[PDB]
Design a protein around this ligand. Sequence first.
Ligand SMILES: Nc1ncnc2c1ncn2[C@@H]1O[C@H](COP(=O)(O)OP(=O)(O)OP(=O)(O)O)[C@@H](O)[C@H]1O
Ligand SMILES: Nc1ncnc2c1ncn2[C@@H]1O[C@H](COP(=O)(O)OP(=O)(O)OP(=O)(O)O)[C@@H](O)[C@H]1O
Ligand SMILES: [Mg+2]
Ligand SMILES: [Mg+2]
Lengths: 391, 391, 110, 105
Amino acid sequence: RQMLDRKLLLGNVPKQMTCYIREYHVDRVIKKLDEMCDLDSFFLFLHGRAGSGKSVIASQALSKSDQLIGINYDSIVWLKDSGTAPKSTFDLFTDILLMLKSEDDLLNFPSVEHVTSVVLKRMICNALIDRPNTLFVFDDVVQEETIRWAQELRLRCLVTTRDVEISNAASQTCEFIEVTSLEIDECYDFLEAYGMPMPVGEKEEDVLNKTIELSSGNPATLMMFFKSCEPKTFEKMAQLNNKLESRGLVGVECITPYSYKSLAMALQRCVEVLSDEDRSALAFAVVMPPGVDIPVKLWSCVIPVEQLDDEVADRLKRLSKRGALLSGKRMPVLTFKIDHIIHMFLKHVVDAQTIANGISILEQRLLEITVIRPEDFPKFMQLHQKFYDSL
Amino acid sequence: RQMLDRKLLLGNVPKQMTCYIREYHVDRVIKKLDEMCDLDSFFLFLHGRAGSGKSVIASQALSKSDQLIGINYDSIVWLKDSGTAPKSTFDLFTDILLMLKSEDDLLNFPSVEHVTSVVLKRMICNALIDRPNTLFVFDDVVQEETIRWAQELRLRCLVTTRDVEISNAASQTCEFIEVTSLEIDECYDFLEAYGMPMPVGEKEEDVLNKTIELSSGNPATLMMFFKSCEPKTFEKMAQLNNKLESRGLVGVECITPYSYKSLAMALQRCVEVLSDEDRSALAFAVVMPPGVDIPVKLWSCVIPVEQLDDEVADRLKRLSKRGALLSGKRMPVLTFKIDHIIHMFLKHVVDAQTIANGISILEQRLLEITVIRPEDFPKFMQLHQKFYDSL
Amino acid sequence: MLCEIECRALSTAHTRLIHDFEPRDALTYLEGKNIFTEDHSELISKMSTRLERIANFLRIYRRQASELGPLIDFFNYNNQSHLADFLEDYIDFAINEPDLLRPVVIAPQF
Amino acid sequence: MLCEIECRALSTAHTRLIHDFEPRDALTYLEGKNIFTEDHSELISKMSTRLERIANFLRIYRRQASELGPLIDFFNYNNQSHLADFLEDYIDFAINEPDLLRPVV
Ligand SMILES: Nc1ncnc2c1ncn2[C@@H]1O[C@H](COP(=O)(O)OP(=O)(O)OP(=O)(O)O)[C@@H](O)[C@H]1O
Ligand SMILES: Nc1ncnc2c1ncn2[C@@H]1O[C@H](COP(=O)(O)OP(=O)(O)OP(=O)(O)O)[C@@H](O)[C@H]1O
Ligand SMILES: [Mg+2]
Ligand SMILES: [Mg+2]
């Protein structure tokens, strides 16, 4: 247990969390990895929402079990991607060449600039010999070119990302683990871990479920709410929820182990990458009942673009498979839902005009001659008047 | 006691003050450091106001006890930060790479700057094996990114700063020691040490008192004033104090060991870093009685921005944390106090007109419709007319 | 590789490894117990001063061995047992009895 | 001198020789059975902590005795027989059988 730490540090792996540790997942990211010791050049995707906590889990999954390093894999290489430029997918590998290199000849390291891709790639798989049992962690991928590079060099990978569609380019081993919103029961533990005041009075307990419904299981902005509650009182929590309904995440924004002071700063990046036409779809999602199971035709009313109303649903599926911006279900009827967090993001970001504009469009299509059934009453349903008033 | 000096000099640690020493604090910065040996990677914060004398104490705490160097820690690395640019948090470590390096191969120094961080970081923790239990002193941290890297480097270091928020981004536990304003009894000692007309007469004693008041115990500005006593006369001290409540530190500015000849030059930097919207809040906080315990509502009157007047308190707490500009007493009632030193600087650097309008707004909100209690007497301008008439 | 405990020992017991020791004496015993290479012994064996052969032996060594065994099992055989005894004492005041290392085996040489 | 077997035993049964034992108790019995010297007993007898007297008793001992007899024939008499029994068991699972562990795992 002292050799790991040597190997963790040198593979640039961050320290695992201790206050709060997820289990089932970490225990599911280790299992699948053991099954693949024999297998080579495989992808493990920790696909999840932003600030949803994926990167922390990789820190822990490689830090609890000592088998992963020493027993199952000889060495670790953990590199943060976050590449947006077209030179980024090449630059990552230059940083992965020196990583793999010896402590000797970092001073004699030549110019990778002159080195071409066919050379950086060949140059890597040429020194990769001295490291047969090597796992690479690619914290925060937002591109596919890297996946192509990996398929080309025949290589192993843990991958933390928000957009899950990147894997489509590859044709090799691909498995998946989704970092969901923190379940209700769990949250408690998280706050308990952080010594959040314990629920006692029904009214105080009343606050309890609400922040969750809002924070919809986002660890980062839960950490942010904690950084906000210095007073450490349910009253403080209530006041912060109030600020949020009037200030969005900006109100809860704060310094934290997250590289980000505000979650809106994070999600930004999830709204830039979006297909130009898909960006719109998201932008109008603001005028929807938050955290509510609502029909497709219901959305067809605010979303831009005949019998081909399926296209709207398409938009809702694509948008849901990119940083988990959207969430939809199959049964009983095809319905999606705008997580409270994303809804708030949209509201605070979209043109103050569009919000009204979108609701107006909803009204334009609002007329016609948990078990919500507006299939038969869409024209005359305003069950979310409360939310509608918010607009 | 001759080996230390070798180690102090090479770790770039400044000479400790000998004429006058804040023993309790120096004796509290050494204690806490001894307690941390087995534990690796720890932060010690000496958070304090500008020129509160923090950096001098680290010079002394590593210079009195010889145990700290040799017995508790093998070597010392003392580096001044003061980084504002985004390249600064990287540049500090380039200067901490060569520090750690051998006298040999400073010749073969490569373009470490033209190397990626993942290399400077790996390159550092690759040579850090040469020196175990190494202590690093980071005189004057302003940014928090350094901490982010440091925690990725599993590092343990002492830290002189004017703020404390950065720890939130950190997640490896921290301890703290605050350099307070020099207590009344202490000050005396400081003067005598530096040699001052010994306080003897009544009117004089009463004249020597006034002096401290303005400085309000700020060591740096308690030094900058002492240097304005060429006549070595208490009479001269009275004269200078009088000049202050008019011209301000500007007139009392002088060449001193300290980085800033004028304290206003120092505090500047504490007013630039300040949140922009939060910057405004502060800027209208120059209409309150100096060195007076005064209520939150009385403040709600001059400060910019429903029962959310708590927003005033949030600004006053943050402002009191960042740069320790303000200070809030929890009991009996939530009240802050604009320290004369924290009061004069702002007064002189800001707009009197703003203060004039500001004073007007204060009076207005007060009218509304040491045991001060304006809860039932908010509209009490005459209370500090001596202060208010100044405006 | 070693670690902070095993390397802190080679460092604490350094005032001593300078007064009586020689890396040439140990090179044969270590090319043997499989912890060196015929360039390693070349590099430490042709060095004008001993503080050179010593600093290279302690540098090269900290990288090569899985542990600090084949160096106690040598100061014994080399009639330098007053050395292998000090280091085995130090390795013992860490695993079994913690705390006692600083009062007992570390302070009497300040 | 002893050897790897007889010294591997004093080492394996070490977690135990720390919890209950004392070199002062054995010094008289060993200055006697001819395995010590009046400086030996001085060196191990004046030691502040016991882990000192123990580490010196186990260092000094491994050099002096032709075998591991006069230390089983002692934990017996000292009411510490749960010790001399463990060590005699260990010397037997090697004396009566020609097979052990090889270079393995
Ligand atoms: N198990 C945990 N314990 C404590 N804090 C957590 C945990 N999981 C997430 N967080 C919070 O989230 C921040 C980092 O989130 P994390 O990096 O784990 O999410 P992420 O999915 O990587 O987001 P991204 O994909 O944007 O990197 C931490 O600073 C902390 O505030
Ligand atoms: N113990 C002391 N003896 C003499 N002068 C002192 C002492 N403490 C502070 N000073 C004065 O302050 C100046 C340096 O202050 P110091 O660097 O100790 O404060 P600081 O908290 O580091 O400020 P900053 O955070 O801006 O570095 C000295 O030149 C001296 O004038
Ligand atoms: Mg991350
Ligand atoms: Mg300074």
